[PDB]
Design a protein around this ligand. Structure first.
Ligand code: ARG
Ligand code: ARG
Ligand code: ARG
Ligand code: ARG
Ligand code: ARG
Ligand code: ARG
Ligand code: PB
Ligand code: PB
Ligand code: PB
Ligand code: PB
Lengths: 71, 72, 73, 71, 71, 71
């Protein structure tokens, strides 16, 4: 979904994405299309921020890379 | 927004209803939210995939409707 | 997701209003979203504990109301 | 403090209360205190808008003044 | 309320529960009973994914075995 | 104002804030005024619980103290 993703960053426990207001459930639904397969344990969207976590055998950086590879 | 997100627009005697793709309601409802009472929009409230928008006094539902299609 | 999540059903001239347990609105609304304009539902919107639903053309609010009752049973 | 409420207006079907970003569910939780007692049939809130309708017998004008003589 | 829960899994940061579309808030409300009496620090729900986290002194695997308890 | 924010706590991954029912998005809105270079990485809000996580550089406690110097 084009330029709705305003920013993608991360840290020790989660990969955080910021979107235009109200776009979070939209972009987050995209990640859930791949989800577990790629190594996304889960994703939760608020209004303009998304939190997603990698599985075991995957670290946040591996997540941060595949996500880029998506958008 | 994007129209591949808006799946259907329709109306009755009280509100104009917009259906969208799962998760898109809030995104699309913010567009209508840019139109004020003067345009005939009293309000707009979105759920997960449906939006209920209602006419401001002085505009009938058909009014709000043709206006929304114009907006799109 | 028993209908014990549904606390009350009633209407007026524009919409049919349902009151559910807190946090059960979206879930109960999905059910109604399985009906469609053909059974007379123009649309359905859920908050946290309340749901507003409204009838399509040629359907009065009372018709939507009786369809919901039978939709839940 | 109710500096979060921006406007209450009406029409033949509902009463709209525009709210600051996010304050919609909080302010709306206020309207659920009134119930069918004070003529409320129900209220749904979004992110910054609330729709509310009068119970049987009450008109929207009545419901409007309730929310005014209550807010 | 039974089949509303599709999957429960975890990693080094949170336990994530996947549920039916729209049941996130209801199920996450079930978790909100346990409180910090258990190992829970917080639980946040979206539409179909639930992110919960362990409080100081508990591991994420603790919170996990305990949530299966609850369910 | 008054009892809107019921608690702020933390663990290994995020700072958890509990609020009054439906107050989460509002409280979260304040948290989003601060970000990245100011400590915060992202803030998600459910209905009464909030999860906030530190920008990759800060300790969850750095972020925590900053949030305290508000509530
Ligand atoms: N219908 C939807 N909005 N789906 C998107 C879900 C995104 C994410 N799993 C969440 O629950 O927050
Ligand atoms: N208009 C609002 N709800 N603003 C608050 C957003 C809070 C947080 N960024 C979230 O996405 O959950
Ligand atoms: N994934 C869901 N929550 N689905 C139910 C949607 C309920 C209703 N149509 C709404 O948009 O508010
Ligand atoms: N936890 C809450 N936000 N409660 C307030 C409910 C507001 C309104 N009845 C709705 O269903 O949208
Ligand atoms: N940032 C947003 N999600 N804005 C959309 C709000 C849409 C509509 N006024 C509502 O309150 O439900
Ligand atoms: N009335 C409710 N929706 N209760 C459930 C809240 C679930 C979760 N603690 C959240 O705040 O996201
Ligand atoms: Pb960045
Ligand atoms: Pb991992
Ligand atoms: Pb009709
Ligand atoms: Pb029948």
């Amino acid at each position: 979904l084009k330029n709705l993703v305003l920013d993608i960053d991360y840290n020790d426990a989660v990969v955080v994405i910021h979107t235009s207001p109200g776009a979070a459930q939209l972009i987050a639904r995209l990640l859930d299309s791949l989800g577990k397969a790629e190594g996304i344990l889960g994703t939760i969207a608020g209004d303009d921020t998304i939190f997603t976590t990698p599985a075991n055998g995957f670290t946040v950086k591996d997540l941060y890379e595949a996500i880029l590879e998506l958008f």
